[PDB]
Symmetry: D2
């Protein structure tokens, strides 16, 4: 049993831009961007609920800006792709209900106390687990094929799940292959199952997963239910921050529990999560580790981190005491300085709402810092 004594399976899932939870996350980030464009100091905590023909915004937004919530929500939904009743949703005729408590208004304190985890594994060039990377890439490929007209029977909603067979390597993980792949994408009433499954197997899966991972034993659950036509908000309710694991690492590492979308820099469960990801990516890309996890706990009012811990999974020459000292030397994790270090006042947050907050190049927390130790 040499094969299975150092081998395991790990699953991770992702959801496309049409998934109602992701509709809500993207709309929340759209509102946050709309406010940040005019008032970079806006204090925004927005929560979105998507149901059959209904978008509900609720939360606290104290800012000097004047935002057209109808326009923002409808433009976000249109960009998602829902523009007809035949698809189960229509930005033109959807209902937007605004319940925001807008009110006229470094060592800033934290927004609330929270656990926040960052994690970096060098098994991919993006320093992220392979399972979530593949799931996000599959959803992105489905969206790309739907939007350019290659497969007109696709619809915005979709859920993907990749099970990857891994082998341990002195504290790190190396992906051997792809044991299973599940795809469930909303479609129209015209196309038949055979065509859909053939297209998903050939045009989508084989154009994303390198052939060195797919072999003849791979298991394919393509449209396992057999009919996915009623989808989007019609087929399920959605809320902001209900897909937190899909956002960060798809199971790997850990999660403090705080949602990301809809929150500005002062809400520490977003800015500090970004800072912990920055620390972990810096340690991994700085050569110190090969797989690192950083836990940071902040308290409300109190500015400085209330607790910090590191776990390198035994992949470093430095006991995580030394790594923690390095993190203190190089990284100032107060929210007031995290803002300046990561430019968290820019309207660059909707880009993070779909296909994961991490592993994408264009984000300041994805640029490792030069560590001096």
């Amino acid at each position: 049993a040499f094969i299975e004594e150092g081998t395991f399976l790990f699953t991770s899932e992702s959801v496309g831009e049409g998934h109602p939870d992701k509709i809500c996350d993207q709309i929340s980030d759209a509102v946050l961007d709309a406010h940040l464009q005019q008032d970079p100091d806006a204090k925004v905590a927005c929560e979105t609920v998507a149901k059959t023909g209904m978008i509900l915004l609720a939360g606290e937004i104290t800012s000097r800006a004047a935002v057209d919530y109808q326009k923002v929500v409808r433009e976000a939904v249109k960009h998602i792709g829902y523009d007809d009743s035949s698809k189960g949703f229509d930005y033109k005729t959807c209902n937007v209900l605004v319940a925001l408590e807008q009110q006229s208004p470094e060592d800033i304190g934290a927004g609330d106390q929270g656990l926040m985890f960052g994690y970096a594994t060098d098994e991919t060039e993006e320093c992220m687990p392979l399972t979530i990377v593949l799931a996000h890439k599959l959803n992105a490929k489905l969206a790309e094929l739907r939007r350019n007209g290659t497969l007109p029977w696709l619809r915005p909603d979709s859920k993907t799940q990749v099970t990857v067979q891994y082998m341990q390597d002195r504290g790190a993980v190396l992906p051997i292959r792809v044991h299973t792949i599940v795809i469930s994408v909303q479609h129209d009433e015209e196309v038949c199952l055979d065509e859909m499954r053939d297209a998903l197997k050939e045009k989508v899966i084989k154009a994303v997963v390198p052939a060195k991972y797919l072999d003849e034993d791979t298991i394919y659950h393509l449209q396992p239910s057999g009919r996915f036509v009623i989808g989007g908000p019609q087929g399920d309710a959605g809320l902001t921050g209900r897909k937190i694991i899909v956002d960060t690492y798809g199971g790997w590492g850990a999660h403090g529990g705080g949602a990301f979308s809809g929150k500005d820099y002062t809400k520490v469960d977003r800015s500090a999560a970004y800072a912990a990801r920055w620390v972990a990516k810096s340690l991994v890309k700085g050569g110190l580790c090969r797989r690192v996890l950083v836990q940071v706990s902040y308290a409300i009012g109190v500015s400085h981190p209330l607790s910090i811990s590191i776990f390198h999974y035994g992949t470093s020459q430095k006991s995580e005491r030394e790594l923690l000292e390095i993190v203190k030397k190089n990284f100032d994790l107060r929210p007031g300085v995290i803002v300046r270090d990561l430019d968290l006042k820019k309207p660059i947050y909707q880009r993070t709402a779909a296909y994961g907050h991490f592993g994408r190049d264009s984000f300041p927390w994805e640029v490792p810092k030069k560590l001096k130790y």
Copy 2:
């Protein structure tokens, strides 16, 4: 040296997210009382003077959502405008629909009923406490419970339902297991009224609550206490915040330990693997820990919609066992049948026992079928 710190959070029954969780589980119980086969997925949104139920509930039951919601809120303890919420005059909007027929397509025999949705779900058990749960989450939940108890019996009449008790503990490693040494930090921030002064609340929380919950062997003289760190916290509950079902998933399970599959528990019946499979994985982990096989174990299962059997199962005993994960997996397969249709029979997931789980964690409490270990036969 082998010493680290770990934090874990918990929120009281008044926290808006937990208001939503309790209301969702109350609707689920109301349906399960009349229709054990009810298919329920009920998300809840709570904010100033508004409770909104949205989701899909297909069942033969006839439920009065107004009474369910208002009695849940009353039991929480919000019964006056001075507290920021009032069950009598709160607004309940019902946007419930029928389960999508496409999902009902994937009808069939019970024993091989397919998964209600795909996804990965984790279980975890560490024997550092008699409940096989991490110490930090246990202490946070007990602090919230003590605050609720003191508020409800009139010992401290200036308390109010919302609270957030949330603790940092110092740990030492020992051959893959963790032993808690002391409580490094404790943060308490509980809603109160205007007439009470800050010094009195901080003294009472230090003496009345902390000393009656945390064993003295953990509290040292160097312990850091952040009691009401934000001065006044009078505006709380759904007012001055917003809630949603399943937005406190980590608070529910292990407070950061192990891992989470991202799936919310509250509002879902047995067909939703997000809840049934999480309960089954917790059962497997507690069975392995209590069975002596390991001192600290993590289990992962994954499902695909319409496929009854798990797509993948994995174990990680953290190096605290004589048995490699391969033969632990074999033990789990021989002893545990993890299909939802057999999980429902084994854990009696059709009983209206779900609101009790909505507050103070789904695990670590003895009265639940998934918290009684199985007799392992290997």
Copy 3:
């Protein structure tokens, strides 16, 4: 002669008008409840706007009703079944905020009360009116407006004019001549029609079709001349209509429902209310009294007013005005009404079978003037 004649206008709105959408949905909920619990106490208001139907009110009943199904079936019957039309029953949002009837009213009205002597469901004044200028004993203007809307709906539904859409609004101005207290309609001075349509049809086509296929098939040639004024689609485009482009509420078209300005109104909405609410029961009873007086030969044009106070079964006040078209002074007519008509809610419910689910039929095209309803059946007067 312009000196001895006058003009009177009256408007009406089609089944697609958001206010009528709300009225029809409220009556649909009332019918759904009355089908199972004839004693259901229902007071439902509906608010319809783009992609949202909201039911708010008090419903105390033993029935179990699927509000989603009722609302969506009502909307489908109205004709909104695609986003291109601005509304879709499949994907519209239905929010239910219904509660139980307040116990105060329950104890003050009907609890522990015999049927014949249950107090008024609420205070207020209610009017009835009958004019013999039409066989339906209704003014010609409102009759013509309702018939124009009905013809538009009929043409849309059978596919004759596929470019029509559910929303519409007609308004007929009629030239009357006074005749010893009564009114005789001479001709139709003006007609304005504005019906929702699609983007691909040209304005001239719609104007010609409305002139020829709709108006000519409804208004008798006796009333149409070459001097009649036609405002057919006077606002160019009417393509963004229905709940989108205009909000709606229950009971916001009360005058369209009863007489289109003739007589008077007590301000009380009809839709969504059961027999205990005098706003509906007493209005129906006053219409019954007025039509009985007109059809019984006593008058040619009559108005009746009743008033109630919550918890008091008997009317507080009753008044008649025959417009000087009778041999009997209003005292005599009022004594006839008292002798022959019993206007308590508890006896009205039995005399008009107000417990049957026949209320959605009244939601569109007016509550009166249609023979299918008990209050439109004159009673044999005995004096």
Copy 4:
């Protein structure tokens, strides 16, 4: 030769009037920053919920939460014990923020110095008196909600009506759980009714239905849903004259439902005050008629012989004042100034 006529009114706390006042408050909030604002606002009040729907095209930036809560506070709902609380009520804004027909009636009767029917005048006065006694602490057991009804006995004078006496009065005002029925019915008779209705109209045969329900503790939006424009007859004449069916509250000048009703009232009051008539009705319709009830020396043909804003200043934020206690019969409004 006499007859009876009833008319009702509703106090500031009535849920329909809560909605009307909130709609007019939103309209005012817009008109203060953009005189050309195009507003059509519908309001719905239910247990602990205020919902704003409709369409507003304007350059103004308005805080709907603040406007609604301040209006509700001015109404008097500031505690759950009263069934509503501006602090914790839910305001849902469904307004369609945008990119910048019908028949109407007017009527005037000189039976009162305000050129309005006596019944609606007395009903509005009774509601106002209840509000005053509730707000100055004279009767602390009163709550904002209230409904009043006056049945007056009239006699005819050559096509004109002259009131004789008040035949019936009904008062139903929300109270608290403490006061007893005897105290409420004595106070509503001696302190409210006797201070409003002149004694020449009240005699020993008058019928008093004071608190006919017995218990009216649950009231306001909790006890009944409300909507904008559901009390249109209470707004104008309480049954007298006629109504075109169009609601007033929430609409700016472009909506003939409001501006044209004001213009028709102006015409009717001008004819009555100018001496031509003693009781006149005017009927207009957009995309004209008169009936002087036989109280003029000249037929309706000689009496019949978008520019209103310039003459009525319909762009000024003076609209919430009209939301409660009737749109007419009050001195301060420009349409109540005969020309």
